[PDB]
Design a protein around this nucleic acid. Structure first.
Ligand code: MG
Ligand code: ZN
Ligand code: ZN
Lengths: 171, 84, 58, 229, 51, 519, 97, 168, 107
DNA sequence: CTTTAAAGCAAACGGTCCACTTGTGTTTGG
DNA sequence: CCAAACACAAGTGGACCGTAAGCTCCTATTGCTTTAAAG
RNA sequence: AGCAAUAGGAGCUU
C-alpha cells in the first residue's frame, strides 16, 4: 500500500560542478537517482510530490576531500505491501503451476495449492486460462488477492499471495 | 531552529585567523580539484595563491558557520566578514 | 591517568561520552572542535548564481 | 577580551603626580585669559575667550578626567603604579601621525575644542569588546574597556592635544580611525586554545627556575596541599 | 636464568674497543646499583671522601 | 581513497556509550564456539576448527582470505569467538563494585534494604549522577543488617526479614560473615550464587543503585561466557625464518581452555570436594590474569621464560601502552631527521634541506591545467634526478612506481591524477626540536634544497627552538595535503611567531655574532 | 622507521590551532583504518563482504542500518581489547541526549 | 542511504514479540507510529491515504513538474512520463493505470466530501474509501477491528459512499 | 538567625532544615567578630533577583550548571543568606580592564 | 633399541579513600 | 527531671598509582627435561 | 611483488 514518506538523501558533489545553476543540477541528480529505487525499509518510491520545488539548503564541505554534502529533505510517496493486507491487481502471466498478477510496481505469483479447488487449468483452450463453472480467470482479469508473504530483496521485491480464502479470487 | 537571523548576529564582523586559514586551505583544495576560478588568472599557478587573490577580492564562495557553546550557530558568508 | 580503572568505571555505569573534547576527537582521528575545526564551511548559493551560464555542469 | 600578543606597556598619565601638576596639565579656562590655550597655536584663538557654551564642555571633560583619576587611584591601582600592559600603543600612533602630516612650523591649528571632545567621546563609545544591544552586554562592554578608555582620555586631553602634540584636524581624524582599527585588531580570536597556551606559558619558565620558591613551591600550589613547607 | 627479575643487571658489559682510552676507562669503571627509582640526589653528588 | 568502495555512508563518531556486554550478546556477535585447546590440528596443516586459530576468526596471512567475511588481510578487522565457561567467574575489574552491591542489597530477595520512607535515602535517590547517587545510597544502606518487611496497623513493603552478611574481600574470594543470634558463620560467596542473587534485582531497584537496564546490568559483571579475540589482537611472529611462538594472549587462552576441561572432568566423576575448589579456582585465576596480571598480594601468571604474561591491562596502560604510546602519540610517515647547521645566508623562514632527503620525501600534487607541463617534466626526470617525481597515483588509487617502470618516457599525465613529486623549494614543512615546551618549538619553514646532509637554519630562530649546532638534530614533517599546507603557512609560519603571548615580547632577536658586530 | 609525533607535539599543534594538520599526522601519515559499525548496537561486530556488497550484524539481525567509520587502527585494536575484557564501547554517529 | 525521521531505535536489553506484521490486527511496524513527525520535528498525525487523495496528489505533482519543465506552459499513460528512467516510467504507468482502474472517486469534489464526512483510525478510514462494501458484514469481517470500538456508523457512511460513487 | 557561642551538636543540627517553610541559619560569635566583606580581598557580593538571574542565563545562553559555583557554606554565601539556585554578582578589581563583573551560582 | 610429539611443572615519602574505634546525645519512661 | 543504651557523630591506620622528551647502536634470547610409545 | 618480537646495556641533544 502507498504511504506518504518524509525521507532524505545525502549526496556528494565535485568542485568542478560549482557553477551558477548548481542547485537545479542537484535537483535533476536527485530526480534521476531516486525515481525508481527500492528500499527494504520503505517500499517502492514511485514519484515525488512537488519534484522541482525540493529545498537543498546549504551544503557543507567535507574537510580533506572538498566535496559537498546535502541533506535534501522532502516528502514523497512510497508503496509497500504487508502480509495479510488485501490488494487488487490484474493477472500478467498464466502457467499450470499458478499465475502472476502485477501489484503496484511489482508482480505477485500465487501457487497451485493456495487456489480454490473448483478452479481447473486448461492448456488447450483458446484462450488458454483457468476455468470453472461460474468462475473465470483469463488474461486481463481483476483479482482481489491477499498477500501472505513478502521477501525483502534490496533491488526488486516479490510477494506471494493466496486466493484460497472467502471473498477472494476472481471478481 | 538553531540558525540565527541575520539581524541578531552578535559575533565579530572580522574574519579570524583560524577561519581565514581553513577557508584558504579549502579554497586551495577546491581549485586544485579543477574547480572554476572566479578571479582573473593572470600569472600565478599555485592554487593557494589563487585562493589568496580570490579571498582579497571577496570572491571566495564559502560560508563560515560559527557554533555557539549551547549548540546554536550563526552563519556568515566570507564576503561579508571583513578581512584585514 | 588511571586509564583502565576509568574505562572500567565508564563501562560499569554506562557513561555517555559527548565527544566534545580535544583528546577524544584525537584518538578517533576526527577534526577537533578546535582552532580551524571550531566551525563548518558551507556552500553559498546567492553568490554562486552570478556566474556565467557556460561554466555549468553538463 | 584581548589577545596576549597584542598588548604593550603604556603609562596612564592621569594616575601619577600632585594635584597641582594634574590641574596644570589638564584644566583649561575660557574666561581666564592666561590659563587658556596659548594663542599662537590655533586659528580661532581670539574667538575662544569668554565663551560659556564651550567652557561647559571643558568642565565636563575635566570632571571625567578627575573621575578617572579617582577611580584608578582608589580602586584599581591603589599603590600608584601607572605603567601597565595595555592594547594599542598611543605614543607610537601620535608620533606616526606627526611624521605623516609634518607637524612642524607650529602652524595655526584648525582643530576646535568641541570637535576634539566629541571625537574622543565617540571613540570611547566605539571600542567594542562585546557586541549586542542587551543590557548585560553593555555593562560588560563598559567594564571591559574602562582602563583603556582611561588611558585614551588621559592622553588625548584638550590641552595636551593642542599644546604638547599640536595635532590638526587631519591628524586628529587619522589618530581616531587608527585607534578604532588597531583596537579591533587587538582582540582575541574565538577558537583560541588559551588553556594550552597558558599551560605552556606557565610551564616553560619552570624549565629555567626562608620562603619556599621555584619548582617545589609551584608544585605545592598546583598540588593543592593541606599543609605547606 | 629463571630469576632474571630480582637479579642485578648490567654487571657484565661488552668491552668498549672504540679507542684505546675508552677501553682503559671501561676496564676501570664502577657502578652503584641504587637505581633510578628515586630522586634522592644525595648519592649522585661528588663527595669530599671521593678525593 | 586507498579503501575499496563500500556502499554505506561515511560519518564520524559523535557519541561513545560505554557499558558491559551481556552473555546473550557475547554469544550473538560471535562466529565460532571455541573449545579445543591445542593450537594446530595435530601439527597438521590448517588447524582444528573450533580451536584458537579457527579461520572463522579471520585471516592473518597475505595469500589467504577470511572464511567469515571473505576479505584480504588489509581489510578484514578480525572476528570474535566465544568460549563458554563451566562455572561463572568474577570479572577482575569489578570485584570491588560487586562487593559494594552485595553490601547494599538484600542477599536473599533482591531488594534495597531501605526505601523512600527514610527521608535521607529518599533524597539520596534524587542525585542525577549515577556515581554520586550510588555513593550516597551505599554509604547509608550498607549498615542496615536486615530486609525489614514493614516500612517504618501493619503495612508490608514486601521485604523478607533475613539478616545481612558483613562482606569482606580476600583475593578473588568474596567472604560474607553472617552474625546469627556468638559464632558468626563465615561462608564463601561463589560467583554463581552472587549471579543468581543479582539476576533477581528489579529494574527500578537496579536504577536506584545507579546501573542501567539496557547497558549495565549488575550481573553482567560476572563472566559466564568469554569472548575470544581475533588473531589480529594476538598475532604470531617469526623468529628465524621457520619458527613461530604464539602471543601471550593465545597461550593464556589455551591455559584457560585446559582449566575449563579439567573443571569438566570433576562434575562427571569422583571429586572429594578438595579438587573441585582447586580446579575452579585455577579457572578463576587464569581468567583473572588473562585480563589483569597486576593483582596485589598474589603471584603473577608467568611465562616459561620467567617473564610475566602481557595482560590486556598492561597492554593498555603507561607511556608505552595503547593510549599514550599509540593514540596520544604515534610514529608517522613523511618525516626526516638529521643534524642541524647554521647558515647566515638563509632567510628567517627558510630551512636548508639535504638533496637526499629532498628526494626521499615527497608531496602529492594533483594534476591541473596550470601545472601539467611542470609535472610531466618531473615525470620524465625520474626519481633519481632533481627535480623529479617518485610516484604517479591514478584516479582509482593504482600506483605507478617510477623506479621499476622502464618506460618512463611513455607516461601521459591525466587530469585529476596525482603525482607524488619530490620535495622542492618553498614548500612549507613543519620543523621541530624536542622537547617541544611551547608552541614556538615547532614552526613551519620554507624549503631550500642544498647539498651536504645537514639541515640549515637562519641563526635568529635558534632561540625559540633552544637549539645550537654542536650535535643537535631536528625533525621535519611534510604536510601531505593543501589544507595542511595552508594551515602551516597561515598559522605556524616563522614570521607569525616572532612575538610570543607568554610575555607579550619578541622571542627572535639578533644574536651571537650580528649583535657584537652591530655594536 | 618513522619519527614519533608524541604528546607534546600534539600540544604544540593544539596551541597553533591547526586541527587539520593534527588529524592528518595521526591518520593519513599513520595507521588509518576503516571499520563498519552496527547502526543499532554500535559495536564493530559487522560482517562485511565488500565484493558481494552485503553487510550483517547477526546479533541485531540487521542488514540495512550499518555505518562505516575511519578511525586509527590503534583505536580499533583498543576497542577490540575492551570487548575482550567484556567492556562494550558503543560508537554512535548521532546524538540523542 | 534511504533514511527518515526514524532515527536511533537503540537497543534496550529486552526484545519485543510485537514486531511482526499482521495488517488484520493493527500491527504495521516501527515506521508508522500513531503520532508521526514532520521535517521540522514537530508532532503530526499519522497519514493513511485512500486511493483518491493519493491519485489526486500524484496527478497534481506530475502536472506541476511538467509545467515547471515547460517554463509555465491529460492521460496517465502520458502523465507518468515526467519521471526519469525506463523503470521509473514503467512503475509510475502501472501505478497510475491501477489507480484509474479502481478509482471510485474520480474527482476532487467527492474526495473533499469524504474527507469532511470521515473526519477513528486512519487505516480503516482510508480502507473504507478504498474497499466498497454493501452492508456491515463485509466491513466487520474483512476489517475485524471495527468490533471493539463501539463507534461503527458503517451503515450510513457506506450508503452515502456508494451513493457518491460515480458510474463505470 | 541563631547566634551561638561554642558548638551546635549534629543531633540538634538536623532539626535546622526540617522546619519548613521557615529558614534557620546559625553562626558562631567568634566567626562574626570581623566582618569579612570589608576585607580588601573580598569584593562586594550582591545577590541577584529571580528576574535578573533569568536575564543573566538568557544573555549568555546558559544553563544553571554551566556557571561558576559557590557553596552554600561559603563564608560570604553564609553571610548573605544564599539559598540554592540564587546567583550573586561580584564586581572586582581588574588590572587589565579596570573593572570586571563576576557571577557565581549557589550549590 | 631409538626417535618424535605432546603435556606438565619452581622457590622511595606523600595523599584519597574506607569503617572500625572511640566518643557524645538523645528522649523514653519512670 | 534524670538515668541510660544504643543512634549517631568524627579520628584514625594503611591500601594503591606514578615518576621529561626525542633519538642511536649492539647484543642475547625466543622452554627444557623426562617419560612413554612406536618402529 | 613481500625485510619478527621481547628484554637488558651503552650512548646523543636538551
Ligand atoms: Mg645542542
Ligand atoms: Zn530481603
Ligand atoms: Zn548490532
Amino acid at each position: 500500500m502507498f504511504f506518504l514518506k518524509d525521507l532524505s538523501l545525502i549526496l556528494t558533489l565535485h568542485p568542478s560542478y560549482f557553477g551558477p545553476q548548481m542547485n537545479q543540477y542537484l535537483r535533476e541528480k536527485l530526480l534521476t537517482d531516486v525515481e525508481g529505487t527500492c528500499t527494504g525499509q520503505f517500499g517502492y518510491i514511485v514519484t515525488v510530490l512537488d519534484g522541482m520545488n525540493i529545498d537543498v539548503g546549504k551544503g557543507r564541505i567535507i574537510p580533506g576531500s572538498g566535496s559537498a554534502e546535502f541533506e535534501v529533505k522532502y516528502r514523497a510517496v512510497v508503496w509497500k505491501p504487508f502480509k495479510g493486507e488485501v490488494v487488487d491487481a490484474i493477472v500478467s502471466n498464466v502457467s499450470p503451476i499458478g499465475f502472476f498478477a502485477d501489484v503496484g510496481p511489482l508482480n505477485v505469483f500465487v501457487s497451485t495449492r493456495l487456489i480454490p479447488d473448483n478452479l481447473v487449468y486448461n492448456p488447450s483452450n483458446s484462450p488458454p486460462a483457468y476455468m470453472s463453472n461460474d468462475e473465470l480467470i483469463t488474461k486481463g482479469s481483476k483479482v482481489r488477492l491477499k498477500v501472505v508473504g513478502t521477501r525483502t530483496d534490496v533491488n526488486e521485491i516479490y510477494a506471494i499471495g493466496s486466493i484460497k480464502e472467502d471473498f477472494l479470487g476472481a471478481i | 531552529e538553531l540558525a540565527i537571523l541575520k539581524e541578531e548576529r552578535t559575533t565579530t564582523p572580522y574574519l579570524t585567523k583560524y577561519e581565514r586559514a581553513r577557508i584558504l586551505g579549502t579554497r586551495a583544495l577546491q581549485i586544485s580539484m579543477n574547480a572554476p576560478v572566479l578571479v582573473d588568472i593572470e600569472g600565478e599557478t599555485d592554487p593557494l595563491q589563487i585562493a589568496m587573490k580570490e579571498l582579497s577580492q571577496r570572491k571566495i564562495p564559502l560560508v563560515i558557520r560559527r557554533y555557539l557553546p549551547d549548540g546554536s550557530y550563526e552563519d556568515w558568508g566570507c564576503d561579508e566578514l571583513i578581512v584585514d | 591517568e588511571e586509564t583502565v580503572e576509568i574505562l572500567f568505571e565508564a563501562g560499569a555505569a554506562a557513561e555517555l561520552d559527548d565527544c566534545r573534547g580535544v583528546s577524544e576527537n584525537v584518538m578517533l582521528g576526527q577534526l577537533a572542535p578546535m582552532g580551524t575545526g571550531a566551525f563548518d564551511v558551507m556552500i553559498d548559493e546567492k553568490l554562486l548564481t552570478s556566474l556565467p551560464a557556460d561554466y555549468a555542469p553538463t | 577580551g584581548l589577545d596576549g600578543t597584542q598588548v604593550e606597556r603604556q603609562t596612564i598619565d592621569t594616575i601619577p603626580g600632585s594635584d597641582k601638576a594634574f590641574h596644570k596639565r589638564y584644566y583649561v579656562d575660557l574666561m581666564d585669559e592666561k590659563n587658556s590655550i596659548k594663542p599662537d597655536v590655533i586659528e580661532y584663538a581670539a574667538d575662544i575667550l569668554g565663551d560659556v557654551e564651550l567652557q561647559k564642555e571643558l568642565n565636563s571633560e575635566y570632571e571625567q578626567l578627575v573621575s578617572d583619576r579617582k577611580f584608578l587611584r582608589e580602586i584599581v591601582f591603589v599603590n600608584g603604579d601607572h605603567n601597565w600592559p595595555l592594547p594599542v600603543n598611543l605614543r607610537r600612533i601620535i608620533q606616526n601621525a606627526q611624521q605623516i602630516f609634518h607637524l612642524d612650523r607650529a602652524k595655526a591649528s584648525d582643530l576646535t575644542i568641541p570637535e576634539i571632545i566629541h571625537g574622543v567621546r565617540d571613540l570611547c563609545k566605539k571600542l567594542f569588546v562585546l557586541r549586542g544591544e542587551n543590557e548585560l552586554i553593555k555593562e560588560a562592554q563598559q567594564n571591559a574597556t574602562s582602563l583603556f578608555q582611561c588611558l585614551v582620555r588621559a592622553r588625548l586631553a584638550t590641552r595636551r592635544i593642542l599644546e604638547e602634540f599640536r595635532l590638526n584636524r587631519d591628524a586628529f581624524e587619522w589618530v581616531l580611525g587608527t585607534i578604532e582599527a588597531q583596537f579591533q585588531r587587538s582582540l582575541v580570536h574565538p577558537g583560541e586554545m588559551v588553556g594550552v597556551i597558558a599551560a605552556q606559558s606557565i610551564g616553560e619558565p619552570a624549565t629555567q627556575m626562608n620562603v619556599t620558591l621555584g619548582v617545589p613551591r609551584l608544585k605545592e600550589i598546583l598540588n593543592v596541599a593541606k599543609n605547606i613547607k | 636464568q629463571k630469576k632474571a627479575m630480582s637479579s642485578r643487571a648490567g654487571v657484565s658489559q661488552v668491552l668498549n674497543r672504540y679507542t684505546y682510552s675508552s677501553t682503559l676507562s671501561h676496564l676501570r669503571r664502577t657502578n652503584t646499583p641504587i637505581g633510578r627509582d628515586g630522586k634522592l640526589a644525595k648519592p649522585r653528588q661528588l663527595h669530599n671522601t671521593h678525593w | 581513497s586507498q579503501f575499496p568502495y563500500s556502499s554505506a555512508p561515511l560519518r564520524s563518531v559523535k557519541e561513545v556509550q560505554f557499558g558491559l556486554l551481556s552473555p546473550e550478546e557475547i554469544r550473538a556477535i560471535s562466529v565460532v564456539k571455541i573449545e579445543y585447546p591445542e593450537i594446530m590440528d595435530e601439527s597438521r596443516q590448517r588447524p582444528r576448527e573450533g580451536g584458537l586459530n579457527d579461520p572463522k576468526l579471520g585471516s592473518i596471512d597475505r595469500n589467504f582470505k577470511c572464511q567469515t567475511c571473505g576479505e584480504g588481510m588489509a581489510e578484514c578487522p578480525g572476528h570474535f569467538g566465544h568460549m563458554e565457561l563451566a562455572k561463572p567467574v568474577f570479572h577482575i575489574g569489578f570485584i570491588p563494585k560487586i562487593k559494594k552491591v552485595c553490601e547494599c542489597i538484600c542477599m536473599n530477595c533482591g531488594k534495597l534494604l531501605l526505601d523512600e520512607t527514610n527521608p535521607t535515602m529518599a533524597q539520596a535517590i534524587r542525585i542525577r549522577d549515577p556515581k554520586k547517587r550510588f555513593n550516597a545510597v551505599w554509604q547509608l544502606c550498607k549498615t542496615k543488617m536486615v530486609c525489614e518487611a514493614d516500612a517504618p496497623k501493619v503495612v508490608s513493603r514486601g521485604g523478607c526479614g533475613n539478616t545481612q552478611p558483613v562482606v569482606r574481600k580476600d583475593g578473588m574470594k568474596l567472604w560474607g560473615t553472617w552474625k546469627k543470634s556468638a559464632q558468626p558463620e563465615r561462608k564463601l560467596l561463589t560467583p554463581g550464587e552472587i549471579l543468581n542473587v543479582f539476576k533477581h534485582i528489579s529494574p527500578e531497584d537496579c536504577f536506584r543503585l545507579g546501573f542501567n537496564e539496557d547497558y549495565a546490568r549488575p550481573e553482567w559483571m560476572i563472566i559466564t561466557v568469554l569472548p575470544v579475540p581475533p588473531p589480529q589482537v594476538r598475532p604470531s611472529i617469526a623468529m628465524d625464518e621457520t619458527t613461530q611462538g604464539q602471543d601471550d594472549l593465545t597461550h593464556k587462552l589455551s591455559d584457560i581452555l585446559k582449566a575449563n576441561i579439567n573443571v569438566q572432568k570433576l562434575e562427571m566423576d569422583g571429586s572429594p570436594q578438595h579438587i573441585i575448589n582447586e580446579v575452579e579456582q585455577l579457572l578463576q585465576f587464569h581468567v583473572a590474569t588473562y585480563m589483569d596480571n597486576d593483582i596485589a598480594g598474589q603471584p603473577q601468571a608467568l611465562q616459561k621464560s620467567g617473564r610475566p604474561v602481557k595482560a590486556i591491562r598492561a597492554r593498555l596502560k603507561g607511556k608505552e601502552g595503547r593510549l599514550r604510546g599509540n593514540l596520544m602519540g604515534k610514529r608517522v610517515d613523511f618525516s626526516a631527521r638529521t643534524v642541524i647547521s647554521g647558515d647566515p645566508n638563509l632567510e628567517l623562514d627558510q630551512v636548508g634541506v639535504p638533496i637526499s632527503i629532498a628526494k626521499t620525501l615527497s608531496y602529492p600534487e594533483t594534476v591541473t591545467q596550470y601545472n601539467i607541463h611542470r609535472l610531466t617534466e618531473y615525470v620524465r626526470n625520474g626519481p633519481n634526478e632533481h627535480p623529479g617525481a617518485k610516484y604517479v597515483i591514478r584516479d582509482n588509487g593504482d600506483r605507478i612506481d617510477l623506479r621499476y617502470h622502464k618506460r618512463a618516457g611513455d607516461i601521459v599525465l591525466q587530469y585529476g591524477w596525482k603525482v607524488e613529486r619530490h620535495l622542492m623549494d618553498d614548500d612549507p614543512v613543519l620543523f621541530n626540536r624536542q622537547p617541544s615546551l611551547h608552541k614556538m618549538s615547532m614552526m613551519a619553514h620554507r624549503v631550500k634544497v642544498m647539498p651536504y646532509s645537514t639541515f640549515r637554519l637562519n641563526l635568529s630562530v635558534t632561540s625559540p627552538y633552544n637549539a645550537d649546532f654542536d650535535g643537535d638534530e631536528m625533525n621535519l614533517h611534510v604536510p601531505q595535503s593543501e589544507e595542511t599546507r595552508a594551515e602551516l603557512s597561515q598559522l605556524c609560519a616563522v614570521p607569525l611567531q616572532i612575538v610570543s603571548p607568554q610575555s607579550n615580547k619578541p622571542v627572535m632577536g639578533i644574536v651571537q655574532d650580528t649583535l657584537c658586530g652591530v655594536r | 622507521g618513522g619519527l614519533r609525533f608524541g604528546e607534546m607535539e600534539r600540544d604544540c599543534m593544539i596551541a597553533h590551532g591547526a586541527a587539520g594538520f593534527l588529524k592528518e599526522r595521526l591518520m593519513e601519515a599513520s595507521d588509518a583504518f576503516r571499520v563498519h559499525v552496527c547502526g543499532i548496537c554500535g559495536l564493530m561486530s559487522v560482517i562485511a563482504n565488500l565484493k558481494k556488497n552485503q553487510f550483517e550484524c547477526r546479533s541485531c539481525k540487521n542488514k540495512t542500518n550499518i555505518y562505516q567509520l575511519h578511525i586509527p587502527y590503534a583505536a580499533k585494536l583498543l576497542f577490540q581489547e575492551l570487548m575482550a575484557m567484556n567492556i562494550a564501547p558503543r560508537l554512535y554517529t548521532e546524538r540523542s541526549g | 542511504v534511504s533514511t527518515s525521521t526514524v532515527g536511533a531505535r537503540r537497543r534496550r536489553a529486552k526484545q519485543q514479540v510485537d514486531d511482526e506484521e499482521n495488517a488484520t490486527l493493527l500491527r504495521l511496524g516501527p515506521e508508522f507510529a500513531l503520532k508521526q513527525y514532520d521535517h521540522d520535528g514537530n508532532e503530526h498525525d499519522l497519514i493513511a491515504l485512500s486511493l483518491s487523495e493519493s491519485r489526486l496528489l500524484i496527478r497534481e505533482a506530475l502536472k506541476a513538474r511538467s509545467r515547471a519543465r515547460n517554463g509555465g506552459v491529460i492521460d496517465d499513460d502520458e502523465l507518468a512520463k515526467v519521471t526519469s528512467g525506463a523503470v521509473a516510467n514503467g512503475v509510475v504507468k502501472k501505478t497510475l493505470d491501477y489507480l484509474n482502474t479502481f478509482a471510485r472517486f474520480k474527482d476532487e469534489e467527492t474526495c473533499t466530501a469524504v474527507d469532511q464526512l470521515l473526519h477513528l483510525h486512519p487505516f480503516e478510514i482510508a480502507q473504507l474509501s478504498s474497499l466498497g462494501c454493501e452492508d456491515v458484514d463485509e466491513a466487520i469481517t474483512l476489517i475485524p477491528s471495527l468490533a471493539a470500538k463501539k463507534e461503527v456508523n458503517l451503515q450510513r457512511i457506506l450508503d452515502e459512499l456508494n451513493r457518491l460513487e460515480d458510474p463505470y | 538567625i541563631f547566634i551561638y557561642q561554642n558548638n551546635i551538636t549534629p543531633s540538634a543540627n538536623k532539626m535546622i532544615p526540617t522546619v519548613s517553610p521557615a529558614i534557620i541559619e546559625t553562626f558562631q560569635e567568634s566567626d562574626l567578630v570581623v566582618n569579612i566583606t570589608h576585607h580588601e580581598l573580598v569584593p562586594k557580593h550582591i545577590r541577584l533577583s529571580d528576574g535578573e538571574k533569568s536575564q543573566l542565563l538568557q544573555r549568555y545562553k546558559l544553563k544553571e550548571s554551566q556557571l561558576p559555583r559557590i557553596q552554600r557554606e561559603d563564608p560570604v554565601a553564609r553571610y548573605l543568606g544564599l539559598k540554592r539556585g540564587q546567583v550573586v554578582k561580584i564586581i572586582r578589581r581588574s588590572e587589565t580592564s579596570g573593572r570586571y563583573a563576576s557571577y557565581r551560582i549557589c550549590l
